[PDB]
From a paper:
Uropathogenic Escherichia coli strains use filamentous type 1 pili to adhere to and invade uroepithelial cells. The pilus consists of a flexible tip fibrillum, formed by the adhesin FimH and the subunits FimG and FimF. The pilus rod is a helical assembly of up to 3000 copies of the main subunit FimA, terminated by a single copy of the subunit FimI that anchors the rod to the assembly platform FimD in the outer membrane. The assembly platform FimD in the outer membrane of uropathogenic E. coli is the catalyst of type 1 pilus assembly.
The assembly conditions were further optimized to produce a sample with an average pilus length suitable for cryo-EM, allowing us to determine the overall structure of the FimDHGFAnC complex to 4.1 Å resolution. The 3D-reconstruction of the complex (map I) revealed that the pilus rod sits at an angle on top of the usher. However, the rod was initially not well-resolved due to its flexible connection between subunit FimAn-1 occupying the pore and FimAn-2 emerging from the pore. To address this, multiple data processing strategies in single-particle analysis were employed, which significantly improved the resolution of both the pilus rod and the FimA-bound usher. Multi-body refinement in RELION-5.033,34 further enhanced the resolutions, yielding 3.6 Å for the pilus rod (body 1) and 3.9 Å for the assembly platform (body 2). By combining the maps of the two bodies, we constructed a composite map that includes both the assembly platform and pilus rod, which sits at an approximately 51° angle on top of the usher. Multi-body refinement provided insights into the movement of the pilus rod relative to the assembly platform. Although restrained by the rim of the β-barrel and the extracellular loops of FimD, principal component analysis revealed a twisting motion of up to 11°, as well as side-to-side and back-and-forth motions of up to 19° and 18°, respectively. This flexible connection likely enhances the range of the pilus, enabling it to bind mannose binding sites on the epithelial host cell surface more effectively. Importantly, it is only between FimAn-2 and FimAn-3 that the characteristic angle observed between adjacent FimA subunits within the mature pilus rod can finally be adopted.
Residue numbers in the entry:
A (entry chain K), C (entry chain I), G (entry chain E): 2 to 158
B (entry chain J), D (entry chain G), E (entry chain F), F (entry chain H), H (entry chain D), I (entry chain C): 2 to 159
J (entry chain B): 2 to 19
Write the structure that this text describes.
């Protein structure tokens, strides 16, 4: 009686054949860096404060894997500055002479190549969360504007 | 060994040349006002209680800027009440003849046009928490439903 | 002098014609059950300790209504166990054969169908609080993993 | 042998360039005001009793500063009453025509603008405590309901 | 001089149109009961000794109401044993088959229905005190574990 | 008989095969460190005073394990000081050359990798408490600003 | 006539399987050591005046346990000072190179590891009281500040 | 054998570099002023009986310090009556227009600002005691109600 | 010089519109009944030796009121024995099946209801005293254990 | 005529089977 059409429901995910599976809330997440003053980034090589984002690994099997690492893939600003991530803002008028950096567990910038992985982290039965930090890196005289970027990650067990 | 692609992360931020930087928790926050009885908003001009939301400014350098004002931009319900915010929840199920206001620290409702700033608030060399209040406003008889709203805010430095 | 686009702010809420209105801290909330040892949840029908949450009502004019009742609604775990919440979390790394159970103030499991309301609670002309408990119910052998559940509630007067 | 994921912890603090550091307990605190009768708050200008609360300053240095003053940045209930906070608990249930006044050590209310500092208090080497009080102030005929207000403070060291 | 953001102060209170107001130290209190022997509570229907806690009433006016009473609400341990508090502690390491009973000044357990008020008490102009007791009641074989109950009370003035 | 939708409730827990279960109030807690002085933290390697927190373990069973230890996982400042956390706040406004660090009951800094556990504590057959002290560590010249750090702990029974 | 919601009443306690039960006045307590002088706590190994307190045990039976002892657990100062409880007040304004230490009835410091227990005391069929002293121990040149300490104790029978 | 969790114990105190140490029984002492009739306080300038409390100092040496004075800091009830302490009771049911006054050996009141000091007493090697008196000083017509006043104190040596 | 933070003090009292003021030693006193033998209280109705305390009234004005009386409010053990206070020492190790009784001046036990006042006593101008007796009262067979109770009292002036 | 309240009285004691 009065059965009407609904809509469309989509699904996403991957059937990984690995020790640990990435959390559904960590596969696709956003990191709200906030706002940065150009005064803190005016000098070449200047670095802003960092915010922390975590990656959650579920159903870890310590029987086959003990150490885990993560490598980040993105678009570098330049060959010389390969650890800094360029800005992929959709609209025009974005920030100039700035980028974003993903730090390591030991407070080191991660190379965006795919062959350099994060610091080895011990895995735990069940849920194992590993932390990361995201910060702004100024390659020169900063300029006000939007600043958004994207990066994928690949986990090695 | 068993290297597997995971997902992706989207960094969102803004670079400004002002003297303060809005907090990461303040650039996008979801104030929740709970439920409001129709008895409170039955008549025109009746205002519900207020729920406080505050915008935090970080790394404020007072040597270049003394005070800071915040203005709000949004869609008013009608020209009769240019100080409220129209509901933008969905096509159906929204409440009728109701709205939400944004109150400055002085106690006067702000103007949702993006040009009328708030009262000047002095700053200090550090974290600055500018307080605000959100209350429901009735433009007539309030019918039951949902109530969601979105408003942009701009910060001036004088 | 200079001005900058600060950001965006969202507001959420509901307008109701009932006698009471649910508090902003009670419309949406999260509780921490805490870790539970698998030894405690060994056989079917096992029960763990119960944490406490509550729902806050306001402006409860006893003239309009004197009693309040609550009916919950979530995802059951089995056809037989209609009163046990299923664990609605990420696909991998979730505890199995166990669910969350909601206890009314009379110490009884609340049906999740959405039509069986809780025991009637008398109201007063002012702020009110209705207590509830969350415990764990195991339908077999409990397994290690996380346990997150979401359940809506509906108040009757 | 067995290793189990426990949970997470967050540490919150502030590094400051002042003479005294605010105590951890006084940085975030919940003053309790119990209940107030409408007969006590019946007509405009009424005032309930005052509930005591103090802010503790740790690791003070007499050489760099000798006096301490504070100023509260809250939200005024009305444009005519700038020294009274506005209740903010939920969109429905709060009390009307009632706010809270914060009295300094001289028994005078402090305006909620963040610039009018309270009376100066001489400091001591080491731990120091600055006393205050909080009371209910009625702007008209009080109405039963909840009453929760928030206010941040800025401390100067002349 | 130098100024810094100290912190935030929250106030919690409630204005009510009642004959009496409840004390700030009595609206939210913690009662320590201490350890109790599983040997003493092993039998079904056992009873431990009681711990005394009291609720303070302020600004009582005998003209408005001459008597007062208190009713309690909380989660009952069982359907049969409806006058015993349940356990509101964490989900692990909590003593089962035991609960807490509220004893009125008449030495009787109070039903947790919320509409069953305790015995009437004569009021006087000024501060009043209403005494109560808390003790452990066993529904079977008591087991080792923690015990942290919780309840919410409604005061009736008539 | 009006029936109205109220809202939603979420639960969080982790059923584990462990000797002891972590307390509900300990799986996710906050530690307020108050404030600290730049003049105090000016020198490199200077340590401020330490505030105390603790992890509570419930439902311990000595039969399966008698000793418990935890290890804290976080983001170090750099390779020079691997035992000091790095602040995680908004992109602007945080302090520089200052980090939170954790000390066990032996008064030693804990390495932040999740592989080096704290000193093993003997457990009882009930509630147990593992204490820790969070303190500020300066890697150089301190700078005023906020400091919000995060860490995750992993319990091991052996 | 008029009904008004007053507030909440919390409870605390434990049910333990032991000969004795710790008194409610001793499950948690605050004891004041008073102020002390740096001139007194000048050199290493100094000692302040010892304040007294006690732990009360109720409902004791001697046919299931004859002797009792306690063990204290807290945070030590250094590796070379395993019986000096540290100071836990805040991130500023606390004394340095001085720590509270606990002495049993014999007059010997109790190790803060939680494993070593106090001197055995005989039990009586009734309320028992075990005395203790608290004092300041200087690990070096003491400095002005506050002194707040916490210690968790366990009872062996 | 059958080890069980006992509880927790808190130690509170201070370390100072002065020539005297305040006794633990006087650091946080409580004084009962009894009761007083409204008839005895009917006009400005009234007084009540003065009960005596002592602040005990031990480990004093005359080589370093010779004089000792105590300065009381509290919330003055009025600007004109700056030597009178207000009432930090609950928000309702407290007395009005009635304050507390702190005396000295000489018999005159002490200003509550804290800059001014009491009469200097010559110290002697060992244990010392400084007496004081507390009474009710009316600022006007008296009204019934409780009165709980908290005041800090500093000690000077010269 | 060398000013140090001595500490803090509290003052508790109450201003009442009554013909008499109660002395501090009466408003807060601790009376001790001492150890008793079970054989003395073997049967129901047997009582221990009675100790004597007293309450002191100050500034009693005969013109305002001439007769004084006292009513005690507490927790009765049973609905059959309503004149005996229950024990509130703790939740364990408290003497069972026994309570305390508060006999008036003439020698009769006073009901624990708040409206049952003592025998009228003529008041003398100045300072007066009212003597009361505290004793034990055991139903059934008394058992070893601590016996601590408490009760509030009201005074009526005619 | 005028009914006010005083303070409170705390009784301390023990029971022994000796």
């Amino acid at each position: 009686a009065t059965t009407v059409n609904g809509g469309t429901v989509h699904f996403k995910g991957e059937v990984v054949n690995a020790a640990c599976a990435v959390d559904a809330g960590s596969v696709d997440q956003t990191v709200q860096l906030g706002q940065v003053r150009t005064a803190s980034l005016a000098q070449e090589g200047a670095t802003s404060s960092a915010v922390g984002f975590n990656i959650q690994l579920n159903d870890c099997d310590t029987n086959v894997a003990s150490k885990a690492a993560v490598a980040f893939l993105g678009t570098a600003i330049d060959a010389g500055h390969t650890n800094v991530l360029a800005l992929q803002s959709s609209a025009a008028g974005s920030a100039t002479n700035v980028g974003v950096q993903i730090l390591d567990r030991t407070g080191a910038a991660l190379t965006l190549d795919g062959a350099t992985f994060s610091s080895e982290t011990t895995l735990n039965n069940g849920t194992n969360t590993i932390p990361f930090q995201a910060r702004y890196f100024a390659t020169g005289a900063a300029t006000p504007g939007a600043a958004n970027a994207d990066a994928t990650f690949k986990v090695q067990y």
